[PDB]
Design a protein around this ligand. Sequence first.
Ligand SMILES: NC(=O)c1ccc[n+]([C@@H]2O[C@H](COP(=O)([O-])OP(=O)(O)OC[C@H]3O[C@@H](n4cnc5c(N)ncnc54)[C@H](O)[C@@H]3O)[C@@H](O)[C@H]2O)c1
Ligand SMILES: NC(=O)c1cccnc1
Ligand SMILES: [Zn+2]
Ligand SMILES: [Zn+2]
Length: 252
Amino acid sequence: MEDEIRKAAEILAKSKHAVVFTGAGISAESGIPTFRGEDGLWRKYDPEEVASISGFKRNPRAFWEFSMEMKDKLFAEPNPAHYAIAELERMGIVKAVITQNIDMLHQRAGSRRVLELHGSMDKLDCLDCHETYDWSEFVEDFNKGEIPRCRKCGSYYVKPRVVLFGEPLPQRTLFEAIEEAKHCDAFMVVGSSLVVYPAAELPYIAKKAGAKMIIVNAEPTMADPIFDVKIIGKAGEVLPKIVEEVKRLRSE
Ligand SMILES: NC(=O)c1ccc[n+]([C@@H]2O[C@H](COP(=O)([O-])OP(=O)(O)OC[C@H]3O[C@@H](n4cnc5c(N)ncnc54)[C@H](O)[C@@H]3O)[C@@H](O)[C@H]2O)c1
Ligand SMILES: NC(=O)c1cccnc1
Ligand SMILES: [Zn+2]
Ligand SMILES: [Zn+2]
């Protein structure tokens, strides 16, 4: 059973307002590659021109062609980990999910409260005429290698609602996440290296507030010491185990 998974369930089974923070690691088992080798990535492309709002206004194609070359799974679906977290919310334990991912796999899995720190691929906006579109109107053409283009004014500046270099983090969502970390009674990290703000700081904020800390990651992080329970392994495998044990403790 492993003492780690049991204690995690022991903690969750006792909390009425738990919060889950997730990073790229929770979507690896869905087919979406993590941020591994980001250093090298910036050796092939100028981050300023292909991934900043400034480079986007200067030439939209750089961003889109850059995305086409790197984006792998466009029709990925939530894996067991996402569902486990949605089941936890239905059970009255998890009250919120804070994620850095832009894949929306938490919502598609049933989570009702998802705070997206880096935005998402849900919608796009034409910067010239202000038409808005759902990612679904372009997905197929994009997978065929076609740069999205406004169907109303024909502009090529159709920007997705994700945070790019040079623009601020969504303040109000960030505000809600921090408040979340301050009043939760259990804070669990899943698939995040916790290296950069806000991922790197939210755990410490919840820790100061008195929350019980749990982490499930494939590799250790520098924040591991503050966690009450830390599990090494895959989210898609560990999460469903924890939920089962919580149900067992509940019905007993
Ligand atoms: N400049 C830097 O030095 C640096 C380093 C790391 C991250 N970052 C930034 O951090 C942000 C993303 O952070 P993040 O934490 O979401 O992504 P991340 O890629 O940094 O971390 C994902 C974590 O998931 C773990 N993981 C992989 N597969 C897993 C699985 N199946 N189950 C559970 N865990 C698994 C990994 O071991 C890793 O620690 C980006 O903005 C990125 O640019 C920057
Ligand atoms: N899961 C994700 O949304 C994601 C986004 C960008 C890079 N790696 C993972
Ligand atoms: Zn337009
Ligand atoms: Zn809350």
